[PDB]
Design an enzyme around this catalytic site. Structure first.
Site, mmCIF file in Angstrom:
data_model
loop_
_atom_site.group_PDB
_atom_site.id
_atom_site.type_symbol
_atom_site.label_atom_id
_atom_site.label_comp_id
_atom_site.label_asym_id
_atom_site.label_seq_id
_atom_site.Cartn_x
_atom_site.Cartn_y
_atom_site.Cartn_z
ATOM 1 C CG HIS A 50 9.817 19.561 7.992
ATOM 2 N ND1 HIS A 50 9.612 18.363 8.698
ATOM 3 C CD2 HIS A 50 10.406 20.410 8.857
ATOM 4 C CE1 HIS A 50 10.061 18.515 9.920
ATOM 5 N NE2 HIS A 50 10.558 19.731 10.061
ATOM 6 C CG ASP A 154 6.653 16.153 11.311
ATOM 7 O OD1 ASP A 154 7.726 16.705 11.570
ATOM 8 O OD2 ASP A 154 6.487 15.487 10.248
ATOM 9 C CB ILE A 371 12.351 10.510 1.481
ATOM 10 C CG1 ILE A 371 10.908 10.804 1.929
ATOM 11 C CG2 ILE A 371 12.499 10.644 -0.010
ATOM 12 C CD1 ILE A 371 10.509 12.248 1.743
ATOM 13 C CB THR A 372 17.664 9.327 2.141
ATOM 14 O OG1 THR A 372 17.622 9.042 3.543
ATOM 15 C CG2 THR A 372 17.579 10.831 1.918
HETATM 16 C C1 LIG Z 1 3.417 11.514 8.761
HETATM 17 C C2 LIG Z 1 4.723 11.210 8.058
HETATM 18 C C3 LIG Z 1 5.694 12.121 7.938
HETATM 19 C C4 LIG Z 1 6.897 11.831 7.279
HETATM 20 N N1 LIG Z 1 7.825 12.817 7.240
HETATM 21 C C5 LIG Z 1 8.985 12.552 6.619
HETATM 22 C C6 LIG Z 1 10.021 13.513 6.543
HETATM 23 O O1 LIG Z 1 9.940 14.653 7.007
HETATM 24 N N2 LIG Z 1 11.180 13.150 5.902
HETATM 25 C C7 LIG Z 1 11.345 11.860 5.329
HETATM 26 O O2 LIG Z 1 12.388 11.639 4.780
HETATM 27 N N3 LIG Z 1 10.405 10.974 5.413
HETATM 28 C C8 LIG Z 1 9.232 11.241 6.031
HETATM 29 N N4 LIG Z 1 8.310 10.300 6.102
HETATM 30 C C9 LIG Z 1 8.626 8.943 5.575
HETATM 31 C C10 LIG Z 1 8.266 8.898 4.035
HETATM 32 O O3 LIG Z 1 6.924 9.323 3.986
HETATM 33 C C11 LIG Z 1 8.406 7.441 3.603
HETATM 34 O O4 LIG Z 1 9.809 7.092 3.668
HETATM 35 C C12 LIG Z 1 8.128 7.321 2.110
HETATM 36 O O5 LIG Z 1 7.004 8.135 1.690
HETATM 37 C C13 LIG Z 1 7.741 5.817 1.886
HETATM 38 O O6 LIG Z 1 7.470 5.748 0.346
HETATM 39 P P1 LIG Z 1 6.541 4.722 -0.310
HETATM 40 O O7 LIG Z 1 6.672 4.983 -1.800
HETATM 41 O O8 LIG Z 1 6.874 3.409 0.113
HETATM 42 O O9 LIG Z 1 5.163 4.929 0.264
HETATM 43 P P2 LIG Z 1 4.120 6.150 0.110
HETATM 44 O O10 LIG Z 1 4.793 7.370 0.158
HETATM 45 O O11 LIG Z 1 3.027 5.918 1.055
HETATM 46 O O12 LIG Z 1 3.434 6.017 -1.236
HETATM 47 C C14 LIG Z 1 2.635 4.837 -1.607
HETATM 48 C C15 LIG Z 1 1.767 5.328 -2.808
HETATM 49 O O13 LIG Z 1 1.003 4.191 -3.292
HETATM 50 C C16 LIG Z 1 -0.374 4.636 -3.458
HETATM 51 N N5 LIG Z 1 -1.170 3.430 -3.370
HETATM 52 C C17 LIG Z 1 -1.620 2.795 -2.222
HETATM 53 N N6 LIG Z 1 -2.458 1.784 -2.511
HETATM 54 C C18 LIG Z 1 -2.544 1.780 -3.885
HETATM 55 C C19 LIG Z 1 -3.298 0.928 -4.796
HETATM 56 N N7 LIG Z 1 -4.065 -0.060 -4.343
HETATM 57 N N8 LIG Z 1 -3.177 1.203 -6.113
HETATM 58 C C20 LIG Z 1 -2.397 2.245 -6.544
HETATM 59 N N9 LIG Z 1 -1.660 3.056 -5.772
HETATM 60 C C21 LIG Z 1 -1.778 2.803 -4.446
HETATM 61 C C22 LIG Z 1 -0.554 5.598 -2.317
HETATM 62 O O14 LIG Z 1 -1.672 6.385 -2.579
HETATM 63 C C23 LIG Z 1 0.732 6.435 -2.476
HETATM 64 O O15 LIG Z 1 0.722 7.502 -3.349
HETATM 65 C C24 LIG Z 1 7.080 10.550 6.735
HETATM 66 C C25 LIG Z 1 6.093 9.597 6.847
HETATM 67 C C26 LIG Z 1 4.907 9.871 7.499
HETATM 68 C C27 LIG Z 1 3.839 8.840 7.613
#
Ligand SMILES: Cc1cc2nc3c(=O)[nH]c(=O)nc-3n(C[C@H](O)[C@H](O)[C@H](O)COP(=O)(O)OP(=O)(O)OC[C@H]3O[C@@H](n4cnc5c(N)ncnc54)[C@H](O)[C@@H]3O)c2cc1C
Length: 455
Positions: A50, A154, A371-372
């Site tokens: 993807h 997936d 993501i959106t």
């Molecule tokens: C397996 C999987 C597949 C997915 N596939 C898709 C898809 O195809 N399409 C889609 O739209 N969405 C997908 N998603 C959903 C998407 O991943 C989430 O919507 C989005 O990433 C959530 O963003 P976030 O910033 O909240 O969290 P995250 O993406 O998890 O990012 C959090 C960040 O904070 C960091 N962090 C954590 N703890 C600390 C700390 N103590 N200090 C500093 N940094 C820290 C982490 O390392 C990371 O880089 C998927 C999710 C999963 C689990």
């Protein structure tokens, strides 16, 4: 010069940073990240097949290269720097660190080799350092995934895709190697409710249905009376149910019937089954099956619940992947935490009882968003923050920002990974993908990465 800090460099951190820089001409935003590399689940979650979904990294990269943004990888907030230190250094701090804990099945047998969370299996094939040695045993012929959402699809897709079809993706060479030797030919995706309760979306469902070399296994009995219950359904939902319905009930034409007969791999949907226990092989060395409780539905609409009938079914399998829920991890004593929802308690992004502390993304709203969803939600937080900043609701005048934190980090022996450092590793990964014909060849060993990051 407003000083803002963001904790986590996934979509929530980056979209919150983008909103702040777009709408405030002077604000400086620093993004802290525990991993050595940026992007969170865009890199480690989104499937290798993807790539299109990962393109948000290009806009993230533009924000990171801007004069008013800085990245600090290899800095674990709550360990290397505390939340209070960040609160003392910046006018506002935004927690955007996702939902890192995977919910356990909490069933007997979960300890058997062969049992894994779906997200850990994904982290393995996506190069997340902590899952590098997952070493899933793919010598079994059947895998069972619990939970009918897109993550489940997936994993099923990766396990059943003809390996040659993944050669030009950024999947790790190590996982692809393991996949080429896999004996897995069947994947069951099991849910405790019925067809109307699936959480998958149509793009992903169609990819599965149309996956070359596979055939779909849907029991028509599970779809009895569905067209009737979807006539008042929302368009997207109805379209998804109609695709399932056609796949389950429509007799295929000659060509499709032939294609299905010659398929060496298969996937299916199993409904009304809840995980009761993972069964061991005779010597207890690995998982040999899953004992499921038969369920029946009660309630109406979204309040539908699965209740046990008393019947059980044993389904043979060598791999059991749990793909149902995640929770945020408590990060630091200065940050309130709701252990039940697994979120930092907040009111529209303002952390409860902590002035100047905000949250965006999964740690704000729970792990339901794609993501959106994460993007628009982060814009909501961004708006509340900027209005609070403009209003004079945060500390007045000077705040040192990174000048202060770096003096602490310097003294502690913590050497952050800058964005330019990351560009060095990025360039190396991409160049290594050149020979093999891949977008990149991810570095998996933290130590080798530290060398390649200039550390
Ligand atoms: C397996 C999987 C597949 C997915 N596939 C898709 C898809 O195809 N399409 C889609 O739209 N969405 C997908 N998603 C959903 C998407 O991943 C989430 O919507 C989005 O990433 C959530 O963003 P976030 O910033 O909240 O969290 P995250 O993406 O998890 O990012 C959090 C960040 O904070 C960091 N962090 C954590 N703890 C600390 C700390 N103590 N200090 C500093 N940094 C820290 C982490 O390392 C990371 O880089 C998927 C999710 C999963 C689990």
């Amino acid at each position: 010069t407003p000083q803002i800090c963001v904790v986590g460099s996934g979509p929530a951190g980056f979209y919150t940073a983008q909103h702040l820089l777009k709408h405030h001409s002077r604000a400086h935003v620093d993004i802290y990240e525990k991993q050595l590399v940026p992007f969170g689940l865009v890199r480690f979650g989104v499937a290798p097949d993807h790539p299109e979904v990962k393109n948000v990294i290009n806009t993230f990269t533009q924000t990171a290269r801007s004069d008013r943004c800085a990245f600090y990888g290899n800095v674990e907030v709550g360990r290397d720097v505390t939340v209070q230190e960040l609160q003392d250094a910046y006018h506002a701090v935004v927690l955007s660190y996702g939902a890192e804990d995977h919910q356990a099945l909490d069933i007997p047998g979960e300890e058997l080799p062969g049992v894994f969370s779906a997200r850990a299996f994904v982290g393995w094939y996506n190069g997340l350092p902590e899952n590098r040695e997952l070493a899933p045993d793919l010598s079994c012929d059947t895998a069972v995934i619990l939970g009918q959402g897109n993550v489940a699809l997936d994993v099923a897709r990766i396990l059943l895709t003809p390996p040659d079809h993944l050669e030009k993706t950024d999947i790790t060479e190590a996982a692809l190697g393991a996949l080429r030797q896999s004996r897995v030919k069947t994947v069951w995706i099991v849910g405790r409710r019925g067809p109307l309760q699936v959480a998958f979306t149509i793009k992903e469902l169609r990819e599965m249905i149309q996956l070359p070399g596979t055939r779909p296994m849907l029991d028509p009995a599970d779809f009895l009376g569905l067209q009737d219950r979807i006539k008042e359904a929302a368009r997207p939902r109805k379209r998804l149910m109609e695709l399932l319905l056609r796949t389950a009930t429509e007799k295929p034409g000659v060509e499709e019937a032939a294609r299905r007969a010659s398929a060496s791999r298969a996937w299916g949907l199993r409904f009304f089954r809840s995980p009761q226990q993972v069964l061991p092989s005779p010597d207890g060395r690995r998982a040999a099956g899953i004992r499921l409780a038969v369920t029946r539905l009660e309630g109406i609409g979204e309040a539908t619940r699965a209740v046990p009938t008393g019947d059980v079914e044993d389904l043979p399998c060598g791999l059991v992947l749990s793909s149902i829920g995640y929770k945020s991890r408590p990060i630091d004593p200065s940050v309130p935490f709701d252990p039940k929802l697994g979120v930092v308690p907040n009111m529209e992004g303002r952390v409860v009882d902590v002035p100047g502390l905000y949250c965006s993304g999964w740690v704000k709203r729970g792990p339901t968003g794609v993501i959106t969803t994460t993007m628009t939600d982060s814009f909501l937080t961004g708006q509340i923050l900027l209005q609070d900043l403009k209003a004079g609701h945060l500390p007045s005048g000077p705040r040192p920002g990174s000048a202060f934190i770096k003096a602490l980090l310097d003294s502690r022996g913590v050497w952050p990974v800058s964005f330019s450092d990351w560009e060095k590793l990025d360039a190396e990964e991409v160049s290594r993908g050149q020979a093999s014909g891949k977008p990149r060849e991810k570095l998996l060993d933290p130590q080798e990465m530290l060398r390649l990051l200039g550390h």
